[PDB]
Each structure stands twice: as C-alpha cells, then as structure tokens.
Design a protein around this ligand. Sequence first.
Ligand SMILES: *[C@@H]1O[C@H](CO)[C@@H](O)[C@H](O)[C@H]1NC(C)=O
Ligand SMILES: *[C@@H]1O[C@H](CO)[C@@H](O)[C@H](O)[C@H]1NC(C)=O
Ligand SMILES: [Cu+2]
Ligand SMILES: [Cu+2]
Ligand SMILES: [Cu+2]
Lengths: 552, 552
Amino acid sequence: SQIRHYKWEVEYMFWAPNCNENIVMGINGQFPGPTIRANAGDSVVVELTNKLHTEGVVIHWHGILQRGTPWADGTASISQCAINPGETFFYNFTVDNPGTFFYHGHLGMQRSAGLYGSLIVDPPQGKKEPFHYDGEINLLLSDWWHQSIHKQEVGLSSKPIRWIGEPQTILLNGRGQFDCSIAAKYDSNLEPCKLKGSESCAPYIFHVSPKKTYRIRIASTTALAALNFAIGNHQLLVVEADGNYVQPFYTSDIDIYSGESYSVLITTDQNPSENYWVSVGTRARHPNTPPGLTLLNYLPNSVSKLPTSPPPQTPAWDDFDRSKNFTYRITAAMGSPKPPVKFNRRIFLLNTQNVINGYVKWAINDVSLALPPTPYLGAMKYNLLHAFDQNPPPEVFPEDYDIDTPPTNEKTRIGNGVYQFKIGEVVDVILQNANMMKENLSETHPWHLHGHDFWVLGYGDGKFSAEEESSLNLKNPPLRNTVVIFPYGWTAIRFVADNPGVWAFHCHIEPHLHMGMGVVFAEGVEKVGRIPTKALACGGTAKSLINNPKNP
Amino acid sequence: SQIRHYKWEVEYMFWAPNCNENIVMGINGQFPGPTIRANAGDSVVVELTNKLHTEGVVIHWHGILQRGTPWADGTASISQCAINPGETFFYNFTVDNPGTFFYHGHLGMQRSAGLYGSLIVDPPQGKKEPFHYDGEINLLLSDWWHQSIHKQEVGLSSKPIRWIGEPQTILLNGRGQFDCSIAAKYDSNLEPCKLKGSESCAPYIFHVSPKKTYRIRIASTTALAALNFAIGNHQLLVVEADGNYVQPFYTSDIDIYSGESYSVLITTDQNPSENYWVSVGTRARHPNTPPGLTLLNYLPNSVSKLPTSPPPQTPAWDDFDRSKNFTYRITAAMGSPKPPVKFNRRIFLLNTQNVINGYVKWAINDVSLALPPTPYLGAMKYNLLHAFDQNPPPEVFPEDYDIDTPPTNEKTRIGNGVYQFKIGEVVDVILQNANMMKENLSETHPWHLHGHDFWVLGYGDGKFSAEEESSLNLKNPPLRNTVVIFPYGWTAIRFVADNPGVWAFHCHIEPHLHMGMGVVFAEGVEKVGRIPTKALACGGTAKSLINNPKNP
Ligand SMILES: *[C@@H]1O[C@H](CO)[C@@H](O)[C@H](O)[C@H]1NC(C)=O
Ligand SMILES: *[C@@H]1O[C@H](CO)[C@@H](O)[C@H](O)[C@H]1NC(C)=O
Ligand SMILES: [Cu+2]
Ligand SMILES: [Cu+2]
Ligand SMILES: [Cu+2]
C-alpha cells in the first residue's frame, strides 16, 4: 500500500467552460481539479491550503467511507469547522475498495462553482479487475450556469424565491458549448461553432482503436440535471455502480442522477471508417439545455470526419416508466454481500416542498434542516448539549397525510436535531415522495448517504404500506451510496450503523440541500478518537475548549 | 355607402411591447395601428404618408378582395412600387362584406416590426348580424422578437443561415410580458411581474358583466407562431371565420394560425364572484415562449383578484390529431355559396425546404420566388415582356417524389414566373407538404390567397391520389382566405379566377415568405383600369413610361 500525497490550493480564477468567461473555483489552477488515483489499501493525504479571500472551504470525498477518520469527511458544520482563508488542513484517509468516485465542495453551493474532480481507486496491487478491457476513458458530468453562485445562493433565500432555472450548459470533463452546436450540420436552425479544438470549450474527444474493449467510467456531480448517456451504434454493458459491481446487462443508454458513478464497457466492433456521437441529454425535467456532445473517434480517422447520423435523440424527459425499467434492472453481482434479514430500526421520511414563513423550503417530516455554527461531530464528542437540539427528530410522518395534494404547511418548522443510532444497528430508511406546492407535481430526488453504502431493497409507487413488505429484495439488492425516488413513489434502503461519526444523508440536488433537504445521522460517537484542532476551532467547540477565564 | 377617410403616417418610434424598449413601426404615433371600422359597401380612403427615412413602405389589407382596385392590394413588386420616403399614396377600396379583418406590412419583413392593426367591417347600414350578443371584444394576436428585423433579415439571407428562433413574447393587442408572469402565484419557479396597470406591457383586460353574451373577434398576424386560445371555465361557440360565417359549434379552445380570423361568442354563465384566465399558448412547434395571458374580469370584481385555478394548459404542441379534429369540423353556414361542381384547372404545389447555392430556401415545385423590381401589375398592363420570366411555372411535381425524404435539391432554382388564369376559370389547388431538409421533419404552413376567398374542399394525409375525389366536400365547404397544410399531408381548395389583377398566394409565416415560399397568380390583367402613377414609378415601368430621349 502506498501513501499518495497531494498538495492543493483552492482559489478562484477566470475560466470559460463553455467559451463564455466567468470565474470558476480552481485547484492548483485547474478546472476540473486534479485526479486522485490510488489502489485499494492506500492512504491518501491531501494538504489543502485555502486561498479564497473571505470564504471558508471544505472538500468532501464522495463515496469514501471515512472509516476511523470521520473528521475527514469534508462537510462543513457536520464533520468539521470550515477551513479559514490562508490556512492549511490535512485530509488523511484510506481508500478501501475500487470504483469510480469523485470529490466536490460541501460548504454552501461551492460545488456548483466548479470545485469538483475525480478520485479513482484500482484493485489492490497485484489483483485484477473481474472484467477485461484494453483502455479506459474517464468522464465527469456537471452543469453550468452563467449566473454567479453568490447571486444564486441569495435568490434561493429571498421572498419571493428566485429559482436558478435550468442550466445553460452540460459540461463533459469541464467543457461544453453555449449558443452553437458541434452537430449543427444536421439542422439548419443550429448555429455552427467555430473551434479549432484548442479552446477551453473544445470537446474532450474519446479516441479508440478498432476491435478493442474500453472501460468508460462515468460520474455525475450535476447540481440539478439528471442525464442520459448514449454513444451512437454501441451497446453499453454495465459492470459497476457507485464503487460496487452489479450483475452485467446491456443497454442502449444509461440514466445517471447526481451522485452516481457507473462503469460501462464498450467494444469497438463497428464500421472503422467513421466516427460516432456521444450524447448526454437531460431527463426528469422539461429540458431547456442543449445536450452535451463529443465524438467517439475511431483512430486513424480525422476527428473532423463527422458521423453519418445525427446524435442519438434523448429519450422523452417524462417517461418515468422507461426510467424505472432501467433502474429496477440493477442487482448485486453474484457473490456480493447480502443484507441482514431483520432490521432493528425502520424510519419513514416524507419529502415535501414547503413555504415556511414566506420562504419556499424543502422539509423532511416537516423539518427543514438549518445547520448549526458548531460542527456536530465535535459537539457530540465533547457532549455540548446546548449547541443543537437534543430532542429526537420525527421517525414517521402521519397516516392521514395525503401525498397527492399540496402541503397545508400548518406545522412546518426549521430544525437541526440529529437521528441517533447505536453502533451495530440495522436501519431501514423508507423515502416517501409526495406532491410539491404546485398542483399535480412531484419530482425525482437523488439521496446520498455519507460514510456508508446501503442495499437498495426496492421501489414502488404511491405510499409505502405493509402490503409492500414482501416485494423488498433481500437476495440480490445493489450496494450504492446514491438512490432516486420517482414522482409520488417510495424507495427502501437498509444499512448497518457500524461507522463511528456524524454523517449527512441528503438530496444531491444542490438547490434542495441549500433549502433544507437533508438530515443528520450519528452513531457510536463515544468511539470517535482525536479530532484535528482545526476541525474544532469555531462555534461552541472552540468556546468550551479555549481556556480563556476571566477574574481568575 | 359612406366614405371613410384616414390621414395616416408610418414612422419608427421607440416603444416597449413587453416592457423592454426597442423600435416599433407605429402609425400616427401608436402601436398597434388604429382600427378601421366601417360598414359593408362603404369606401375606405387612406392617404398614407411614408415618414421613414431610407425605406419604402406598403400596407396590405388582409382579407379585403380589391374587387375593382388591384393597385391597392399593397404588395410591393406585385400590385405596386413601394411608397418612397416623404411621399403620400392613396389606398381607396370598397369593403364588400362584414367580418373581422386586419391590415399588415407587406414589404420585406416590416410587419414583424409592428406594422399591423384591425379592420372591422360591420353589416350594411341598417341590417343585423345573424346571431345576438350584447358586446364584443377585439383581440389581435402577434409575436415579438428582441433582435432587430433588419438583423433578422440579414441572418436569413446569410450563408450559413441564422434562424431567427422562437419568439420572445406573445402579444395580445400589442402587450405581453417577458421574464416574469402575471400568473406567478401558481408556481414558485415563475417570477412575479411588478406592474401597476399603467404600463405599455400591462395586459389588456376583458371587462364583462355577468349573464351577458359577447362576440370576441380574434385575428392573427404572427410572423411565426401558431397559437391556441382558451378561456377558463368558458366554452366557445364558433360563429365566424375569415369574414364568412360557419356552421356554429362548441369548443373548449381554438387553434389559430397566422392570417386566420375568427369570432367566437361567450356567455358569462359562470360564478360572478371571480375572474377567469385568458390563455394564448404555442402549438405546432416545440414551445419556448410563455403564453400570453390576460383576465376575463367579471365586473364589479377587482382586477387584482386572481382566479382560483392556474391558466389552462395549452394542448400538447405536437398532437396533430387534436388539431385536425378541430380544423376538419369547420363547415360553411347553411345559406353559404356552394362551389362550382366542376373545375376548369387543377394545379399541384409541392412545398419543400431546399439548399440553393448554399442558401436555405423554401420552394414550390422547385422554384423559390425572387420578386422583380418591376411591379407585376404594371409590367403586365403595359406588356413589358422583359420584366419577368414569361415561361409558365411548373404546374405538377414528379409523382415519383418521395415526400418522406429530404430533398436532393438537384434541379431546385430561383425564379419569378407567373401562373396566368382566364377570367372565369374555376381553379383547384392541391397543396402538398413534404419532408424538410432535416430528416423526419415536416411543419404546418398557413397559405393565404390575396384578392379572393376559396372553398376548402378537404385535407388528407400523405400524397394526394386521384382516387381521393369522393372525400372532397362539394356540399358544405368553408369560405376562407387562409388554410393550413399539416405535416406530410395535402389540402385542396377551389376559387374562381374572376378578379382582374396579379395576386400573391403565399405562406403566411413571414420568414418562409422572405425565403421564397409563395407563388404569384394573375388573371384578366387586360381588364385593369388606370393604375396610380406612384404605383408605376419604378423599375421597367418607369423606364418605359418616362419619355426621356437622347440628342434631344
Ligand atoms: C495527516 O498526515 C500528515 C502527513 O503524514 C501528518 O503530518 C498529519 O499529522 C496527519 N494528521 C492526521 C489528523 O492524521
Ligand atoms: C383616392 O381617394 C381620394 C379621396 O376621394 C382622391 O382624392 C384620390 O384622387 C383617389 N385616388 C385614386 C387612385 O382613386
Ligand atoms: Cu420542451
Ligand atoms: Cu431534492
Ligand atoms: Cu411556410
């Protein structure tokens, strides 16, 4: 096992992701940030200096379990106090298992401004992957707004709310095109982009040789968009989902929601004299954004040799039946860990959009999360019982709640209590979707749990009821970190609370998390060891720990 | 009989349709134009003074037949030379029959710049309409882009074409809202408009008293948009269409294409304690323009009192079956003129989108119309055989043409020939739609005939064949001046060549007309009397009528 050491500075810079200049949050002058790659078993050490002028910052490693290092999770106000300007924090953690992961900002809406990058983990040195491939292509998907994130943050916190709107561009490895299309030769209404390929917004072309097999690692850090990925004329075979192996299956395209990572295999068994289209189209919301496009360039053909066909037409945004047909087909690879069969706790969380005191907020069992200035992990290790609400948050919603109609908002509160588990508890979480404030509307929401992987026991329509117990999958369920709830539906997951620390479980659409959509889980905090001083040096933790008497 | 005399000037002026300033082409300092209201059989005299600085102007009176006065049709290069800066021209014509008509610019793309207004002809002095209502409401629908018309015109003439795009705002009597909605109440994702009622973009409210019946006259002069009109909780009785009366029927909403006019009657039956929404939304093209909205305000309710329901959602833009369902009902009122049973001429017109010398043009049986600088009416009266092509234009297309494939463009040319008819011929026209340049696309095209009304004999899908004859409605066919062809279909119409003149028959979507989609019909030109000298004063007619010898 090696120690992989990175030394990084976060700083804003001018950049033009879609050839339109704005400021982006860069790491060591790069947008997207540098790739961390390691082998399972290695220690990763990142010393990060903050060089934003007035802003704190933190970096979360999405999908890394942080087992034994809960202080390195990178979530402001839950694992640590943010890192102040001009200061340096060390994130030292181990990578336990292979898979496609990524890292991103977790303080405010800093991740929509560009703070993200890939973190890939390979098998232990000497071991090999269960499947063979010749080459690898890595792809990080995100979305881009031309508006400042500091104005987006303010507009989402105003009465009337000012929603961020659909993004302007879909970004493939940090690049995209606004107001022109690289596939404009198939439709005279489209404006041709003039690009020699040397520009910051020039497509990242996938180069493949004939008759080979390639692993395409795909990860999503979209702030809002749900995407559909298809290459013209090529079957995709799914082999990996969120750092875990799934039972292989072919599909013509995959849907990917923010927080998910997949690895697909392709074989370049097509006509070798032409190049093919890669389309990343928006679904689950009425599209207002052009698709992200690039070429699968069969070498030696000139990359300017355009495909004979158009890009694959993206599937209808609202055909949720086609989306469930994909999602329900995902099962654990033969030989994967099977769940505990009985649970020790089952919690029900109702997801609603609400209007609290004029403000539109998202609530979970009528509590919209407002994170405290004291980091929960420090607060609970030092038993600071005034830092947040000690009263246990609701583990059930009312059976007279009608999920087909707008909230009444009669009892909706903002809060910051923590669900607490005992070390070793098996927990089931049933996520229940409902109608939003507008009549006859319910949306998809990706939910991601920090510091754990869970088994996806099942999905259903309407409200979960006891009749649905026998449909939950206990033989084959997939292990994931991100899961979706569909319009008016439920999704059930199970996990063992075996990892000491305080972990966020939240919706991965960033405006939703900004508006309160997430909860806090804590387990076995009695067993957490020493926390770095910098993760404690704010709020009530620094108040009790800094000895500064008076008269003494 | 009575003469209605108007003293008018057209000048560009600064104005803000949707509260965003731009320049608008206004008449006597106002946008939209002044309404002309007269009774059938009166004589309208308009002395227009062109107050533009470097441009010519013409006004066309859409729907009026120009029976006896072909020189006042107001089509530059067809009935007249355009009126030069600082000059005054007289348009004197007879309004023959009651109905809802309008007038609009007909030189270049000047109508999209705001040059249009209403022309309502009431029954003969002392006669009554064949139905009863207590009031009427006049609505003129149009659409508005934020880019210059002169930059739009250069973009459609460029190689590569810059398509003008979907309109920014739908206007209801010249007002509309952009980036905000007066119906923001029902949706947190919409922005409220901050209007007091006094503004240039504040909605024209429809004031009604309860338990009364009204005639809402609706006309379309849109450059591009096909719209659908609907009133919350109110069914519509269709009683007039294009100045003619139809067999009455009920409907929840009407589709209106550019160039069409309708009168619909409503009765204020509904609950008198509230207001109801008027919604005019986009159909037949994928929408990317919010609907135009206003209120049916039941007096004495406050106009600030919103409806309980959202606006009616516009029917799906691409449900062409629902569209045909409405379109195919329209039948002439009993008592209307039946068509000649036998025809004397039948022409077949293939509507295609082509690429001529790298330019994207529209064409009819492979000729894209380029209008000459000599006005056709003057050229043909004075028998100037060198002013245009005297070869008859193509009257049939190849029956082997695949209307489901992009055009090859092989023989597609630009030209300016004229179809000539004998004074009295009963002419049949089958308009045939086909696939455009993009694979798998055909669009709707509103066709308008000048100086005539025609009977709509029928519509069908695919290619017209002779075996189609028994479906043609010779019994009840509506009398209209505009008719749509649907994607991949034909429409057949019949009219009588009985009005001496040169008349345009074109697509009423202004960009397509700019791109060549239209043809010219001339009949009985040797029966035309004296043409006004200003209408002759350009091109070949000026050259051949100004006596200016040399040596003298
Ligand atoms: C993190 O790693 C660095 C380098 O090995 C070390 O100096 C530092 O003390 C470590 N801190 C923690 C909290 O492990
Ligand atoms: C048009 O009508 C006006 C007013 O009667 C008259 O002065 C003018 O000469 C007429 N011109 C034509 C061409 O009829
Ligand atoms: Cu759409
Ligand atoms: Cu969400
Ligand atoms: Cu057209």
